[PDB]
Curated annotation (Swiss-Prot), chain A:
Protein name (database record): Small ribosomal subunit protein eS19A
Compartment(s): Cytoplasm
Other facts: Present with 29000 molecules/cell in log phase SD medium.
Record carries keyword Metal-binding: no
Entries under PROSITE patterns matching the protein: RIBOSOMAL_S19E
Quaternary structure and interacting proteins, as annotated: Component of the small ribosomal subunit (SSU). Mature yeast ribosomes consist of a small (40S) and a large (60S) subunit. The 40S small subunit contains 1 molecule of ribosomal RNA (18S rRNA) and 33 different proteins (encoded by 57 genes). The large 60S subunit contains 3 rRNA molecules (25S, 5.8S and 5S rRNA) and 46 different proteins (encoded by 81 genes).
Effect of residue 101 to E: Decreases mature 18S rRNA, protein binds 20S pre-RNA complex poorly. Lethal in double RPS19A/RPS19B mutant
Lineage: Eukaryota, Fungi, Dikarya, Ascomycota, Saccharomycotina
Gene Ontology molecular function, alphabetical: RNA binding; structural constituent of ribosome
Record-stated family: Belongs to the eukaryotic ribosomal protein eS19 family.
Region forming the signal peptide: none
Keyword annotations from UniProtKB, A to Z: Cytoplasm, Ribonucleoprotein, Ribosomal protein, Ribosome biogenesis
Species annotation: Saccharomyces cerevisiae (strain ATCC 204508 / S288c)
Curated annotation (Swiss-Prot), chain B:
Residue numbers of Phosphoserine PTMs: 32, 59, 74
Gene for this chain: RPS16A
Positions of crosslink type Glycyl lysine isopeptide (Lys-Gly) (interchain with G-Cter in ubiquitin): 28, 45, 57
GO cellular component: 90S preribosome; cytosol; cytosolic small ribosomal subunit
One BP term from GO: maturation of SSU-rRNA from tricistronic rRNA transcript (SSU-rRNA, 5.8S rRNA, LSU-rRNA)
Protein name, entry field: Small ribosomal subunit protein uS9A
More info: Present with 33800 molecules/cell in log phase SD medium.
Localization per Swiss-Prot or TrEMBL: Cytoplasm
Curated annotation (Swiss-Prot), chain E:
Membrane-spanning ranges: none
Other remarks in the entry: Present with 30900 molecules/cell in log phase SD medium. There are 2 genes for eS17 in yeast.
The encoding gene: RPS17A
Name recorded for this polypeptide: Small ribosomal subunit protein eS17A
Family: Belongs to the eukaryotic ribosomal protein eS17 family.
UniProtKB/Swiss-Prot annotation, chain F:
InterPro entries for the chain: Rbsml_uS13_C, Ribosomal_uS13, Ribosomal_uS13-like_H2TH, Ribosomal_uS13_CS
Positions of modified residues (N6-methyllysine): 47
Function: Component of the ribosome, a large ribonucleoprotein complex responsible for the synthesis of proteins in the cell. The small ribosomal subunit (SSU) binds messenger RNAs (mRNAs) and translates the encoded message by selecting cognate aminoacyl-transfer RNA (tRNA) molecules. The large subunit (LSU) contains the ribosomal catalytic site termed the peptidyl transferase center (PTC), which catalyzes the formation of peptide bonds, thereby polymerizing the amino acids delivered by tRNAs into a polypeptide chain.
Record's subcellular location: Cytoplasm
GO biological process: cytoplasmic translation; endonucleolytic cleavage in ITS1 to separate SSU-rRNA from 5.8S rRNA and LSU-rRNA from tricistronic rRNA transcript (SSU-rRNA, 5.8S rRNA, LSU-rRNA); ribosomal subunit export from nucleus
Name the UniProt record assigns to this protein: Small ribosomal subunit protein uS13A
Modified residues (N-acetylserine): 1
Organism: Saccharomyces cerevisiae (strain ATCC 204508 / S288c)
Gene name of the encoded protein: RPS18A
Keywords attached to this entry: Acetylation, Cytoplasm, Isopeptide bond, Methylation, Ribonucleoprotein, Ribosomal protein, RNA-binding, rRNA-binding, Ubl conjugation
Family: Belongs to the universal ribosomal protein uS13 family.
Amino acid sequence: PGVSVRDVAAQDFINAYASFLQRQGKLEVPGYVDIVKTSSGNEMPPQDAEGWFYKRAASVARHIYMRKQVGVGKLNKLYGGAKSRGVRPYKHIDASGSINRKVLQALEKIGIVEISPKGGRRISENGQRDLDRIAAQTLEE
Amino acid sequence: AVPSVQTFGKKKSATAVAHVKAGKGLIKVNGSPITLVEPEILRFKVYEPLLLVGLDKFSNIDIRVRVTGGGHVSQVYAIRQAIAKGLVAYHQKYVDEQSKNELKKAFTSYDRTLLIADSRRPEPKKFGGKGARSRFQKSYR
Amino acid sequence: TPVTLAKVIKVLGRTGSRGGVTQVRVEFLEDTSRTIVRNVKGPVRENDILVLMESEREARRLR
Amino acid sequence: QQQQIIKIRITLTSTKVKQLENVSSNIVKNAEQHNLVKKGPVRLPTKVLKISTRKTPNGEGSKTWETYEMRIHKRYIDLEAPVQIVKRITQITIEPGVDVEVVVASN
Amino acid sequence: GRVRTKTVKRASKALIERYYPKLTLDFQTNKRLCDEIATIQSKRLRNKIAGYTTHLMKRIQKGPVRG
Amino acid sequence: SLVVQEQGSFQHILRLLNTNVDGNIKIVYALTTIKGVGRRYSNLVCKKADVDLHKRAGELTQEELERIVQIMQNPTHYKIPAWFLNRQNDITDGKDYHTLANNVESKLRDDLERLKKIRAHRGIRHFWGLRVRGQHTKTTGRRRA
Amino acid sequence: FTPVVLATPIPEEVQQAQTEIKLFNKWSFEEVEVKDASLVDYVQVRQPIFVAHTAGRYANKRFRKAQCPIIERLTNSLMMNGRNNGKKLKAVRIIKHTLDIINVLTDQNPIQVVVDAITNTGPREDTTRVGGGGAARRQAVDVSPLRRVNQAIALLTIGAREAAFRNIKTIAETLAEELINAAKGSSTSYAIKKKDELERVAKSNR
Amino acid sequence: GQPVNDFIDTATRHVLMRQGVLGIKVKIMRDPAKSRTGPKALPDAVTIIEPKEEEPILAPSVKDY
RNA sequence: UUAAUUGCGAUAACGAACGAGACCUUAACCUACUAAAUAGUGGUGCUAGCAUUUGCUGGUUAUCCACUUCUUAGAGGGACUA
RNA sequence: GACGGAGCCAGCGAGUCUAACCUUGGCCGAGAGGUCUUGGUAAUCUUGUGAAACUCCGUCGUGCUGGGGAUAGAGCAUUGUAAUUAUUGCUCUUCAACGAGGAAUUCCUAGUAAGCGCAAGUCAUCAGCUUGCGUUGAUUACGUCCCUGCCCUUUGUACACAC
């Protein structure tokens, strides 16, 4: 019947889509990776320095899919976190915009998203091709 | 045409709106099925109203639920509250109350909060104390 | 076994400097003719069951 | 020329509920006696205006912050009528304490 | 506690002899008739007088009450 | 799964730039014990050396250990972006450097005598032993300062 | 049982719970009872429940916490650190793991073991202070059943609390070990030994 | 209570005499029964109408026309 | 007896008043009244996509219609210890 | 518990044309920030304030440790004419005491304390403060006057500036 990405686990979808992205090898990893802590308030780039960008790509894909259109700022706010400001109480700080912009600019060429003339980045038909297909595959894995 | 009733549930600030119509048994929360409700330790808690009276009646009824506001567990109770309310509403409008009263009896006998919203609500906070009740630490000399 | 079973038949009232102890009349389970005033700490109701180590020490410090 | 329609919208701002709905009811009943089709008077969210300040002119004593909270109430009403009678509805149905703004719209 | 003030007791007293046969054991109807037979500024106070006079109506029904 | 079945070739407590570094702890965090090298300057050198991240300090071979030392000495040569360094764009010779264990304390004295030679306010605070960053000295600084 | 087929796929491990209510779909309330007189119908187990998180109202009336299912109160008692205020769902995660542990420990339903532990670690009698002068005295009398069960659960969770501090030991297995020892009787657990000690102090300072 | 706003009006004045300043705080309650705004009865006040009761009639009849 | 000089009741006291209370505001109830592109919802309604026995989405009063249960806020009703 | 990845749900606000306010989106930028434009005088644009605890998965594995961020060093930015006696934030370098606390003492009985975050006053920049808002959300008791105070009756008094 119909199997789109809402009946499948979100975390498993992101993991499996990252694995699919890694095998397919069309992610144009920007290269400067593993120097950005992925959060301006964090203290280190991820532990999975070899697949975390692909995880970010899959997560952003699902995020843009589930929303109408999302801009870089709403990428930063969601992908930020509580910075341990030291001897002061925690405050949420917006993450690095570089990873958000580069992952979106990456999805522009594969075709997952487009510039969304109304707003920021919105899902595309090409993205709908692969995402729901990955959901279907992972369902009957 | 299509017989549809609408209900809602409410925790402190999480508000759930549900549509109960005669159908096949599609249970969703913001587009995700009842089996992917977050978190896993609380998924069976929203499952509760389904199992309290057996899935045979839900084989004829499909409920669409959208939740806005509040917190995660507040939703987790809000959807189940709304499901019990929508079930009793549909089986009042269209099905005999000989079954409907048994439904309401079972729900409130299991827990009274399934179809009655707990009026436990926050009260304002008063100057001189972080919480509504407690005051600041006192000094003497 | 030095254990005695008794059941509340009457709650009398609260004593103690802090009011944290209550006088209660209690009749045994193993027989229904031995009833004694005793004292209890926490919240209490009627017909509650009490396990007495020594079922002889009558209540002291009544009011 | 043939009774041109305007799609006019009127905003009514006030703090006092009694006077705000006084002028609102005046306007609505004038429209009704004109036998007019429109959208009902939409009541805006209760705009509470919350500000907190010390009660002590000095700093001595128990700390007494206490708040002066306002209740701005607004209603906007859609109307479809000629200029000749919207000018009547703006020259009348007014009182102190309420401010009414009339704006042409395509809504 | 919920102890009733002298105002509500006074009002219920003055109410009962003046309109005893019309008063009844039913709080709902009594609360309604409190509109015609008297004016109470707040619905809450009107409910208070009604609630007291219902109990007095019942108590008079079972035995005379001095006062 | 890195289920290891090795021989008795494990190398215990070791010296890198004459600093004691344990062999049992993971390399990335154990290497912060060399003075002047912190958590991130220790992670990035490992990933740029492409050495195994999920391995202890006694399983990495000598050649990659020496190349890690080489990278630590030469941050200008391994794509380190010059904002990731300690001595960003120094004062005397203007070059971009990184200070190491045998020299972190040397530069810690060095900036000190230059400040107390120019008789700067921060330098004289360093001399007296107070704070330098303009904090509140009235309530704190009693148990060790 | 010929389970029903629904347009929403519901797993058979949920479908099978339709027959009888099963705590976490693994632990049953049948063949489980409070073996301790004076604590029956106070260590409330008869009524059914599936998870130990309920949005109840038990601080409203004097004895309305008595009917609350014991698993909820115990899990709530795991919520006790000063940093662990809130995190009731973390507490229910911990109880899930520890119940799984106890089932493997005893060839028996874990809730029977926890009921035994509560009953055996609820101190029967203790003392209250009497005498406002310099020579105060401890006067010891028996304890109400609800006070007993509250002390029992508090002491169980406190033994787990002390053991979990500054050690590699997982809280789930710590709590399971403490509960099973409190039930069977070993005096190698903190709760049973403190129950013994408090009752003994009452026995001596009569 | 709000009857302070409903029925009291207050007014404070500073009066400068040769020696200093005198404070004058005039607090006035208007008659609630008067004026044509808001309530005319205090929240506590209870008003009872005259029942105008009549003598019972013991002759049932009909007025036909 | 009450949180209460809150009341019952005893009375050389009676009847009163202010404070408390009463008052008002906030919060929860109302599938009931009133509505609404600055709130939402239903339409194998408009269009298009997805996966294909049909479920999920994007522009939908400005691409329409019907409504106010969720939202809002007026009038009220509701508990007064029944 | 920390770290990293992912899931990811509010309310109470506020905001510039009597002007440089709130800024979406795109771009530069590790970050900090800069940038062109958009929308908003405001239930509409910030904004579904996608906030954090929480959840899942993995690393650490009893080591004052990867907890902790104190002091200090170097650089990059914004506001202000002006950041020096560090404004603040950001980058990296350092991980000090602190293994839960003696007398003593504070606050607190249900959406409660406490954990968690956000908004707003402050404001050119500065929030460890504070008012509010919410998110998660206990235990224990429904009492007593023993301690501390307050009040009442009686009592005593040589006090009334009132012990």
